[PDB]
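Exercise 7. Predict the joint structure of the components listed below.
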Amino acid sequence: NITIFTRILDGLLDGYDNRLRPGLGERITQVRTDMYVNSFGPVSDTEMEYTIDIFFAQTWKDERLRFKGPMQRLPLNNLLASKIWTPDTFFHNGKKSFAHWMTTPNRMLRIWNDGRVLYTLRLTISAECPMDLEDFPMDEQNCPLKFGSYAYPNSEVVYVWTNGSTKSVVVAEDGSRLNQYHLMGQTVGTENISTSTGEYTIMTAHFHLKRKIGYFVIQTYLPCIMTVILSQVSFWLNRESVAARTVFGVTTVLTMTTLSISARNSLPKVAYATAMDWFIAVCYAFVFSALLEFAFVNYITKSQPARAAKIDKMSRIVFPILFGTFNLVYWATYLN
Amino acid sequence: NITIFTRILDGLLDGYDNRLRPGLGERITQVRTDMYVNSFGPVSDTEMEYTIDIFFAQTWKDERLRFKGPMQRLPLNNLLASKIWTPDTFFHNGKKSFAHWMTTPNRMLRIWNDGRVLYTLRLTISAECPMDLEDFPMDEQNCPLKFGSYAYPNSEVVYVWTNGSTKSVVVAEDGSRLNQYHLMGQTVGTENISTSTGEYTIMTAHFHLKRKIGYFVIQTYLPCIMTVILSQVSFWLNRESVAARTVFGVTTVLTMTTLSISARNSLPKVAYATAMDWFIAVCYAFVFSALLEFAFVNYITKSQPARAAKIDKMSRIVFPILFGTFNLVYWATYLN
Amino acid sequence: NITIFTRILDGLLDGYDNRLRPGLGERITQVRTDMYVNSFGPVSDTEMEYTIDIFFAQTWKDERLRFKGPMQRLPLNNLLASKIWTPDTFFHNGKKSFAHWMTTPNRMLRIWNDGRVLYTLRLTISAECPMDLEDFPMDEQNCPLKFGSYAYPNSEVVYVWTNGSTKSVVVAEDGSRLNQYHLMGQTVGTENISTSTGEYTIMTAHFHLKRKIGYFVIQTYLPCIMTVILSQVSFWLNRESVAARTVFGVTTVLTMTTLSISARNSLPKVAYATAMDWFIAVCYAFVFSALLEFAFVNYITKSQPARAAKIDKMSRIVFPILFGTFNLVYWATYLN
Amino acid sequence: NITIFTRILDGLLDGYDNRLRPGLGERITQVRTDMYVNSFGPVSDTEMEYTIDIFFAQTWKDERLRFKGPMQRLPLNNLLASKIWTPDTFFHNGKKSFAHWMTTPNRMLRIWNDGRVLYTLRLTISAECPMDLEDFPMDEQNCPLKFGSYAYPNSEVVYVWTNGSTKSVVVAEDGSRLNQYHLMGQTVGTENISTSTGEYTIMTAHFHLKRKIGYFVIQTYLPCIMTVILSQVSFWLNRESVAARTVFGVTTVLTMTTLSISARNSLPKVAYATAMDWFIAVCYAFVFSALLEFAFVNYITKSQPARAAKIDKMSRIVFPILFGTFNLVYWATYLN
Amino acid sequence: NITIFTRILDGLLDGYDNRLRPGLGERITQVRTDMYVNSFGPVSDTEMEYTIDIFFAQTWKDERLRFKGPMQRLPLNNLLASKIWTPDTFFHNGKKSFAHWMTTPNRMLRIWNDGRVLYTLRLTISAECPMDLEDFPMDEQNCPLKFGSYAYPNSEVVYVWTNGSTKSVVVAEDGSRLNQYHLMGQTVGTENISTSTGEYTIMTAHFHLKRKIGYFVIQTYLPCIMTVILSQVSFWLNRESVAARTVFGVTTVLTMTTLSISARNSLPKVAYATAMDWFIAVCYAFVFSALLEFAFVNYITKSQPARAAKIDKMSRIVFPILFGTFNLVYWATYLN
Ligand SMILES: Cc1ccc(-c2noc(C)c2Cn2ncc(N3CC4(CCCCO4)C3)cc2=O)nn1
Ligand SMILES: Cc1ccc(-c2noc(C)c2Cn2ncc(N3CC4(CCCCO4)C3)cc2=O)nn1
Ligand SMILES: Cc1ccc(-c2noc(C)c2Cn2ncc(N3CC4(CCCCO4)C3)cc2=O)nn1
Ligand SMILES: Cc1ccc(-c2noc(C)c2Cn2ncc(N3CC4(CCCCO4)C3)cc2=O)nn1
Ligand SMILES: Cc1ccc(-c2noc(C)c2Cn2ncc(N3CC4(CCCCO4)C3)cc2=O)nn1
Ligand SMILES: *[C@@H]1O[C@H](CO)[C@@H](O)[C@H](O)[C@H]1NC(C)=O
Ligand SMILES: *[C@@H]1O[C@H](CO)[C@@H](O)[C@H](O)[C@H]1NC(C)=O
Ligand SMILES: *[C@@H]1O[C@H](CO)[C@@H](O)[C@H](O)[C@H]1NC(C)=O
Ligand SMILES: *[C@@H]1O[C@H](CO)[C@@H](O)[C@H](O)[C@H]1NC(C)=O
Ligand SMILES: *[C@@H]1O[C@H](CO)[C@@H](O)[C@H](O)[C@H]1NC(C)=O
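Solution:
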C-alpha cells in the first residue's frame, strides 16, 4: 500500500532539472512569503545590530510536480528539499546568519496536486539597525529587515506578501520581550532597486521600538540630583568654617566627574552630544558654581561683610528654585 | 557465522523508503520520549538563557523492520541511523543547540523483532528562561523546555511520556549543582497548539529553581549595614568639631552611591525597582538624614543651644532603633 | 520546451575538464574584477583589524562554454559553479574570512554565447590595517585591501579593473557609517610582486579614514580642563587656611592621575607618546605646580610676608594666561 | 612491487561489514587504552571546567583483518579508519570537545598479521571539575576524567588499562604548568554503572591539584595587613586633634570595603564563607574598632580625662599584640 | 590541443594508490620544508599563546607521477591534492589551527617530469609560548614552533630544511609588528624524539622576542614616582598643621595601593615576585615611612622640640637622595 507513494515520488524526480526554475522562458515566477517571529533578540547599541529568530516560509507554483493519488498532500522532510529547485532568497542587511540542525534540519516540504509547493525554514538573523542617538534615552528606533532574490531579476522572480499586513508578519506575545525596549508594532512594504546586473524586487519589514526609561533614572539621573542637593547644604554652614565647606565643594565636583565617565561606558561611543550629557553638564555647573560662590564670599569677608552675608543667605533659596525649574523644562521637552 | 546478521541488515534496507513514515495513510504513529539530565548548565540572567546537557531518547514502532534470527536485539551505531526514517523533533525555545561528535557521533540504534526502534541522542541545549526579577534576590523561577514535531501534525505523529513522571525525567545528583540556584524538582505536561499549518502536539518540562542567598549578603547588604553604623558615630562627637563630623557625612553618602552602581553591574538592566534597590534607598536616607541633622543643629547652635543639645542626644538612640526595626520588617516580608 | 536548455547544459559539461584553465598553453587569461561595499565594519584599533562586507565579482572568457539557443543568457545558481573552472582568488591580508550560506549560498553564475562568464560572490573580510597613532586623535589612516591569484603566475592569469576607478569600487551611502571615523574616499592601484614561485599580479584598494573628534573631548579633554580651573581657586583663598588649600592640591593631583589610567584603557597599548598624553602631562604640571607654590609660600610666611603676598596675588592672573595660551598652540598645531 | 600491498588492502575490505563488531555473538571484545597528556589546559574556577589535550590510543583484536606478506606492519592514515569498525568511545563529563584537522586529520591506523589494531587520536577536552572552595585558597582539588562506550554494554565491549598505572597515563614535564596550580600526581580506576539500557564499564582517571599561594598574598592579604597598621598610628596622635584622627578612621574603613568587593570579582560567586573572607572581616573589625575607641575617648575627655589617657596609651600595645596573635593561628591552622 | 594534458592527468591517476607512500618498502622518503611568515599574531601573556600566519610548503619526490609532454610543469589547484598521497604533517604545540577557504581553498599542487611535487598550504597557528616573567618587563622570550610526522617514523619519512637558515624561514618587514614586542631574529634546528610508537624526526624554529618598554613607564612607573614626590612636600610644612600633613600621608598611601592592584590586572597571575613589584614596594615604603616620621615627631614635639626640628629638616634632603640613588641601581641593574 505504501509503495504507491514511492512510485509517485520517483516519477516526479525522473526528468527533473533542479537547475531550471519553473516556467523558464515562458512567464514570470511568483513567490508568496510569510513570517513568524518566535523571539526578538537583544539589541546591541554598541554594534548597531539586533538578533531575531523567525520561521520563514516561501510558496510558489510548479507544474512539473503535478501528480495524482489518494492523498492530496505529501508531508516530507529536508531530504527531498535539495532534489528540486528552490529560490535563492537572502537577507541584504544580514551580517551573520545560521540555521538550526538539531535534532534534524528544521525544514518542511509539502506538495499539492495542482503543483503548489510550501517550503518553511527556521533561521537566526543578526541584522544591522542604524540609530540616531540624539534624543537618548527618549529615542524611537525603526529597525528594518530586507530580503530578496540574489540571481533572479524582477523579470523572472517576484516576491509579494500574502493576505493583509497582520497575517503577513506575526510576533509572539512572550517573544517580544526586551530589557530596554518596547515593540510597539510592525509594518511591511515593497520597493524596486536598480543595480548593475539589472532590476530586483525587495521586500522590507520595519519594526518600531520605543526605549523604556527607568534603568537610567536609577543609574545616572538620581545620583546627579542627590549630589546637587548635597552641595547646597554647604550654604547653610558658617563662613568661618572654611575647611568644612571646602570638603563639600571638592567632593561633589569629583563625584559628578566620575559619573560622567561611568555613564558613557555602556553607551556607544557616539561623537555628538546627547540629552543625558546636557543634564550632567547642568548639574556639574550648579556644584561648580556653589564652590565659586564660597570662594568669592571668603575673599571679601574681611572688607564688606554686609554684602557677603546677603549672598550666603540669598543663595539658599535661589539655587533650589533654578534647579527645580530646569528639571520641569528638561523632562517636559523630551516627554512631549 | 557473522554473515547471517549481514544478510538480515541488507534485507531490511531493500525496498525501504526513508522518506515515508511507518504506517503512512493507515494509522497515527506513536512516539515515547524519555530524558536524562547529566548536568544543568549555568543560568545567564543577563541573557535570560540557561544551558543543559541531556540524553534524549525516542522510541517508535515500525513494521517494515521485522526480522527473524538467533538474536532478538541488534546493537548498532550512527552509521545506520541515516538509512531509515527518524522523527524530525526540535526544540521550540532552543536558541542554539549543538551535538557531540568526538570520538564518534554519540548516537545509538537498536531494533527488535516486533519492530520496536530505540534512538538515543546526546545534545546541549541553550534555551530561554524569562524571569520576573521583582522580588530579587528572593525569587523563584520556572524555566521550561519544549519540544515537538516540526512537519508532522498531531494527526500523524503524537508524543507521549513513558511511565510515571519520575521515570520520564531524571537529573543527576552531582549534575544539579549551580553557584546561585537550587534545583527543587521537576514537572512534566502536555498541550496542543493550533498554528497556520495545522495542529501539533507539544511536550513540556518545567524546572523549579530557588535562588540561594548569601553571596549578595556579603556583597551588598553588609557594606550598606556597616556604612549606616559609621554615620551614627558622628552624633556622639561634639558640635563644635564641624570639620570632623563633616567628613563622616560626606564620605558615607558617597560610599552608598558607589555601591548602588557596582551592585547593579552584574544584575540585568531591568527597568523596574527590585527589593534590593529599596534596601539601598532606605540605607541612603539614614546616612543622608544624619548629615541634615548636623547642618540644622549647627545653624541654631548660636541662638537656642538648649534644643540643639537635645536633638544631638536624641538622635543617638532614635536612629539605631528605626534601622533595626526596618530590617526585621524587610527580611520577614521577603522570607515568609 | 524547457528541455532545450537541459540539453545545452549537459552538452557543455561533456568533455569538460574543470582542472584546466581556458586557453591553457595557448595565451594568457584575463580577469576583470569589480567590487561593491555594502557596509564598512567596525575598526578595531586594539587588534589593528577592520571588518568589511562586499559583493566580489569576477569575469573571464572561456571558449569551451560557447552555445547556441533562443536565449543569449543562462541565469543559474551555485549548483553549477563547482562543475567548471574558477579562479583561486584570495586576500593576502585577510586574517579571517567567511561566506554567507543562508538561505542559499549567495553566488551567481551567468554564461553568454561568446563565452563570457560572470561569477559574483558575497564575503565578509577581517583584514589588518596597521596604524601610526603618533598624532592621535588627529590622525588619518589608510587601510588597504589586497587580493590576487594563489597558484597562477602573472604569465597565466592577470587581474585588471574594469572601467574607471569610480565604477570599479562603490560604497553604499548608509553602509559607510562608523562611530569614530569618516570615509573620505577610495583609491585603486596595481602592482607586481616577485616571490620564490614566480611573479604574480596584485590588485590593491586603499580606503582613506579621517577620525572624528568629539568623543574624546567629552571623555578626556574637558575633565582635565575643569580640574585645572579647580586648582586655581585655591590661590584666592587665604594662606592661614592651610588645611583648606591642602585639600584642593591633593585632590586635584589624584584626579588627573586616575584620568590618565582610565583614558588609555580603550586606546591600544602603544609604546610611544601621543598628542593626548602630552596634554595630560601639561595639565598635570599646572595642578602639581600650584601645590608647590602654596608650600613655598607657607614656608616663608613667617620671615618675609611681603613677598609671599605678591606671589599669591601674582599667581592668580599668571596661571590662567599660560593655560589659555597653551591651548591655542596645541589645538592650532594639530588642526592645521 | 608496491602492488603487493595494494592487493592485501583490497582483499581485507572485501566482504567486510563495518557495522558489526569483531566476534559478534561469539565472545566479548576487549579494548586496551593508553593516554598521553601533552599539556594541561587552564582551570576555570568560575565555570568549573578545565581544558586538556591528549593523544588517546585504543587497541583491540580483529580476526577478519588477518593477512600475510613481507611486512608485519602496515602504517596508514585516517583514510582507511572509516572503512572498518572502531569503538564509539565518548567522554561522559566532556561538555565540549574538538579535534585537530590541520594539516591532516591527526589519526593513525596500524594492523598486524595476528589481527591487532592500533588507533590513536588527538583530542582537546573541556571537562567539568566540581570544587569545594571552603578552604580557599588553601584547597586541594581532584579533577576527574571519565570515558567509556556509548552503545556497547559491558557484556560486549570491556575497557581495561594496559600495564601499570605509570605507563597507562603520562604527563609532559613542561605541559603540566599552570599559573595557579600544581600537578602533584595522577591516579586511575575502574567501575561499573547500571543504567536503563543495561550495564556499562567506565574508565576513570583522577588528577590531584594543589593550589599555589603567593598571588593572593600580594593581591589581598598584604593590603589588608598594611591598612590595619595604618589605623594603629592614629592612637599615637593627640586626642585634641579630632580632625586628624578622624581622617585615619574614615579612610581605613572605606579602604577595606573596596578590597572586599575587588577581591571576590575574580573568585566564583560561591554562596558560602571562605577562609579569605574571615581574614578580611577580622581586619575590618580592628580598623572599625579603632574608630570606636577614639569616639568613646572623645566623649569622656571632658569628665574623666584620667581614664581616657590610659585607654589611649593602652590601645597602643594591645592592638598590635592581638593582630599578631591572630595571624599565627590563621596561617598555622590552614597550613597544617 | 588541451586534451593532451587531460590524458596525462588521467593516466597518472590510473593504478595509483593514495594510501601508500612513494618508495614503500624500498627506501626512506625525504621531504624538504620552507616557511614564509606573512604576519606575527598578537602574543597573549595571560594564555601563554601566540598566533601566527604562514605559507607552509612541502616538497618530495614520487616516481609514480612521471610523465612526458610539451610542458615540464602542470600548475593545478586543490582539486587534485586529495587524489594522491601527501604527508600527514602536524604541529605538536599547536593548540588550535584553522585554514582559509575563501574564495577558494588556498592550496597549490605542481608536478615535474622527474616526479618532484610541490604542495604549499596557508595556515593560522595558535601555539603555546611558555615564559619566565621573573625580570618583567625587562625580559626576553624564545617562542618555539614544532612540526613533524604523526604516523611515519624516522625510518620512513625524514624532514630537512632546504638551503641555508635565512632562506628556510622568512618574515615580512611589515608583518613583524607587535604592540609590546620586537622580533630580533629567527633560528632553526632539528632533533630526534623517542616515543612509544618508535622514533620520529622533529623540525623546530625559534623566535627571539625583546619586549619594548615605554607603555609601562607611562602606566605604572611615572605615577609611582610622582606620588613619592608628593609625600615629601609634607616635610616642608609646619608641625602644628597636623591636619594638613595628615592628608598628605593618608592619600599618598592609598594611591600606591590602588596602583598595585590596577597594574597587575593586565599582567598574568604569576605566583612569584617580579621586578616591577619590588619597585612599587620600595615606593610604598617611602610614602609609608614619611607618615611614620610625622607621627614620631608629633609625639615628642612637647618634650624635646630641639631634636624634632632637626628630624623635620633632615628628612627634607635625606629622602630625595635615597630615592634618586635607588632608581639608578634599579634601572642600571635591569638595563645591563
Ligand atoms: C541584487 C544584486 C545582487 C548582487 C549584485 C552584485 N553582484 O556583484 C556586484 C559587484 C554587485 C553590485 N551590487 N551589489 C549589491 C547591490 N545592492 C546592495 C543594495 C544596497 C544596500 C541595501 C541592499 O541592496 C543594492 C547593488 C549592486 O550594484 N548586485 N545586485
Ligand atoms: C509547529 C509549526 C512549525 C512551523 C510553523 C510555521 N512554519 O512557517 C510559518 C510561517 C509557521 C508559523 N508558525 N510558526 C511557529 C509557531 N509556533 C511557535 C509557537 C509559539 C511559541 C512557542 C513555540 O510554539 C507556535 C506557530 C506558527 O503559526 N508553524 N507551526
Ligand atoms: C603569490 C604566492 C603564493 C604563495 C607563495 C608561497 N607558497 O609557499 C611559500 C613558502 C611561499 C613564499 N611566499 N609566500 C607568500 C609571499 N607573499 C606574501 C606577500 C608579502 C606581504 C603581502 C602579501 O604578499 C608576498 C611571498 C613568498 O615568497 N608565494 N607567493
Ligand atoms: C551508558 C549510557 C548511555 C546512554 C544512556 C541513555 N541513553 O538515553 C537515555 C535516556 C539514557 C539514560 N542514561 N543516560 C546516561 C547515564 N549516565 C550518565 C552517567 C551518570 C553521570 C556520570 C556519567 O554517567 C550514567 C545514565 C542513564 O540512565 N544510558 N547509559
Ligand atoms: C610522534 C608520536 C605521535 C603519537 C604518539 C602517541 N600516540 O598515542 C600515544 C598514546 C602516543 C604517545 N606519545 N604521544 C605523543 C608524544 N609526543 C609529544 C612530544 C612531547 C612534547 C612535545 C611534542 O612531542 C612527544 C610522545 C608519546 O609517547 N606518539 N608519538
Ligand atoms: C516594481 O516593478 C513592478 C513591475 O511590474 C511594478 O509593477 C512596480 O510598481 C514597481 N515598484 C515600484 C516601487 O516602482
Ligand atoms: C490534544 O489532541 C488529542 C487528540 O487525540 C486529545 O486527545 C487531547 O486531549 C488534546 N489535548 C488538549 C490539551 O486539548
Ligand atoms: C607587471 O607586469 C606586466 C607584464 O605585462 C607589465 O605590463 C606591468 O607594467 C607590470 N607592472 C609593474 C608595476 O611593473
Ligand atoms: C564489573 O563487571 C565485571 C564483569 O566481569 C566484573 O568482573 C567487575 O568486578 C565489575 N566491577 C565492579 C567494580 O563491580
Ligand atoms: C636523528 O636520526 C638520524 C638517523 O639518520 C641521525 O642521522 C641524526 O643524527 C639523528 N639526530 C640526532 C639529533 O640524534
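Discussion. Chain B is about 35% helix and 30% strand.
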